[PDB]
Design a protein around this ligand. Structure first.
Ligand SMILES: [Cl-]
Ligand SMILES: [Cl-]
Ligand SMILES: [Zn+2]
Ligand SMILES: [Zn+2]
Ligand SMILES: [Zn+2]
Ligand SMILES: [Zn+2]
Ligand SMILES: [Zn+2]
Ligand SMILES: [Zn+2]
Ligand SMILES: [Zn+2]
Ligand SMILES: [Zn+2]
Ligand SMILES: [Zn+2]
Ligand SMILES: [Zn+2]
Ligand SMILES: [Zn+2]
Ligand SMILES: [Zn+2]
Ligand SMILES: [Zn+2]
Ligand SMILES: [Zn+2]
Ligand SMILES: [Zn+2]
Ligand SMILES: [Zn+2]
Ligand SMILES: [Zn+2]
Ligand SMILES: [Zn+2]
Lengths: 224, 232, 224, 232
């Protein structure tokens, strides 16, 4: 039975069959020592907490904690670009450590070359999506403003040291949301399938000449 | 004493699209077309559709109900008498019927054993331009003469097959085979300029399947896809 | 060049690879001779028209027609149950016949047995879905009231002579929307996959004991 | 002069789940475990992981870069010297490495060639109850000793295989094969009462695949599915 407790950054449990954005980008890698989170025990205002440095006083049975990363500056207005994470924990008072299981509420975007390797090159990759929404401060959920206009968002490469995150929204199959510009020449990049993006989702931009003229599709029925 | 034949289509689930929907068997096997037909345990003999009538004695050692089997187009004299080698291009249909001796009409339910290929524009409408569309697929296989099933020669090399437009009035049929996701099987040539057309997903083609080539500039620089995992 | 024109009931062009509810239930079978539709040429109020009986006076170049089936009694409030169809045509004045291409704006529900044959039996099949929405009178589109509560809708068999139609809405994978009652014993029927239902969509209820204990699922990756 | 071995996992696309994610090769091939390892064009010889070191002479006729191949569990003395027959249950891993002679460490990238089976409750959490879960699948195949690939015997009959829970500390592995949609392959028995567990979709299982058995009462009376066609 400890007086104060420390915080550790863990990930929410992923789909056994599908990779989550937490599988691709652990919460530990974003929320490192010295990073500030907004934390609260159920029914308390969010207060800043410095990860790997701060401790909090244990002042029944089990306590539920809630955390936002980055720290907060009810619901709030939000924009895309910077990732937004929401964590929860259930701990017993007196525990030395409290493990927050984070979930990424925004959607990271990765650029891959033809061989699924991370793209490094001079081409500019942009997406035209809704970039304004509302976040629920109690459960972390982001919902796009349906009245919002689609905006051009540039997608960053791994060498840029920041991952472009978009707000959760539905992308329709064949929706021409993307563009690739290389030497003042633009080409379209579209979704092949319907993507109803949510917390834990990842978006991949796959560059190639494989579908230059169009696509091959088909059905596989079964006769009786 | 004798029975007539009617050309019908084999069923699938009520919600599933079959190539029969787009290309009904009755549109291929018209009056004057010849099929190889046999009763179970008997040899395939020619039958002229919309003209011939068959005697109810030609049923083998069947009693109560007779099962008929038919190939379209008709077989060679050697194949009419287990398996045969086949190539792509021309469609191959296999039909079955269950009838009681004495019935005036016998409805043959045809399955399409090959896979038709349709060229569509960006809006799913039949492409009508002057661009050349080709596919690089395996074009040799074996057909089971008793159930109509075609299985590709895995040792076969992929060959270039030109795809006909809807207006050409003949549908390019390919043999059932697996096409892998991202497999660069297609090409579109227009004014000595070629572009690639690839599969977006795995397609394990079988009888009743249809293949669509959907031309557009939508994926000039690549594709957007992603994961939507569920938190159960 | 004709003075008056007759109307013919056709279907909107379907997805070459997927069966539409028009493929399952042609518009011709619903809108038979003697059935009344609300029709208008672009920029005119909808007026009743008796199919296979009425004719209309041709009083530039091409005319666009719009039609609702059943007839109307801007936007309007709608409920599930009875199917709702919306048709359009582009015709040249003087044409003897005008072919309306209809699209089903509601979603039919079919009950199938284990062998995909139409279910005839004594079991009661119900769905718990939103049953109130709004229809666009200019394009036929139905959008569910998000504030609406889910209601129990009984699903009809083919012998009942009426097809249960639901309003377009998203059904999530594993959503326990269905129930089957046979001899005062109820069982759950859930969606296996995400279904973002729209005009042209069909819903199938497949009864069996195949998934009594649960389901088998898996992934098929590809190593580099 | 000598090199050590490290157990790593083979890669797939950054967005795809492999069985390696859930079951890392390093958790199976621990210190003291024996693997059959060979340099290209040479015989498989045993190697004790976390203990042995191999001489840089055992590389065949390679120069510049050497390719290594490894089997886990280790092969029989006859298989160490083209193909072998295999059964389900115990997992089978195949690793490769490309190294330059003189390197102090060689990292073997293991692929899982068999398919692990996990039992989950309604919420994707590992099932911990007393119910018996069985699958009826083909349990005999052939493995390629040069690339690790397992291909099922199509002539094989389906056999009942009991599935172990996560707590049992041994994972039931099945051989790669196609499972058809609606195929009633599974059974759950609890208190002498059996229920069926079937596949909802076609699963053409291969190396790196995982199979999940998700128990619930959600589909007691059947399933809701449907079509959402697009009007392009
Ligand atoms: Cl059918
Ligand atoms: Cl990987
Ligand atoms: Zn963790
Ligand atoms: Zn932000
Ligand atoms: Zn790839
Ligand atoms: Zn390429
Ligand atoms: Zn598809
Ligand atoms: Zn032929
Ligand atoms: Zn050839
Ligand atoms: Zn376009
Ligand atoms: Zn995909
Ligand atoms: Zn029509
Ligand atoms: Zn109504
Ligand atoms: Zn079925
Ligand atoms: Zn059954
Ligand atoms: Zn799945
Ligand atoms: Zn074994
Ligand atoms: Zn056996
Ligand atoms: Zn439940
Ligand atoms: Zn399905």
């Amino acid at each position: 039975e400890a007086t104060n407790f420390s915080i550790s950054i863990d990930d929410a449990l992923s789909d056994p069959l599908t990779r989550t954005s937490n599988d691709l980008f652990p919460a530990r890698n974003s929320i490192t020592t010295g990073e500030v989170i907004s934390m609260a025990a159920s029914g308390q205002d969010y207060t800043p907490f410095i990860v790997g440095k701060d401790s909090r006083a244990w002042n029944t049975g089990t306590v539920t904690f809630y955390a936002h990363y980055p720290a907060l500056t009810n619901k709030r207005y939000l924009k895309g670009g910077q990732e937004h994470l929401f964590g929860t924990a259930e701990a017993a008072p007196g525990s030395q450590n409290v493990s927050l299981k984070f979930k990424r509420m925004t959607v990271p975007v990765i650029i891959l070359d033809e061989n699924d390797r991370p793209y490094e090159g001079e081409a500019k990759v942009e997406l035209s999506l809704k970039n304004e929404g509302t976040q629920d401060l109690l459960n972390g959920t982001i919902e796009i403003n349906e009245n919002a206009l689609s905006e051009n968002i540039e997608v960053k490469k791994v060498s840029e040291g920041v991952t472009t995150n978009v707000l959760p929204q539905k992308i329709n199959a064949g929706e021409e949301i993307g563009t690739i510009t290389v030497g003042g020449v633009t080409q379209k990049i579209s979704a092949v399938e319907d993507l109803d993006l949510k917390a834990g989702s990842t978006l991949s931009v796959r560059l190639s000449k494989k579908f230059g003229g169009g696509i091959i599709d088909g059905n596989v029925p079964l006769y009786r």
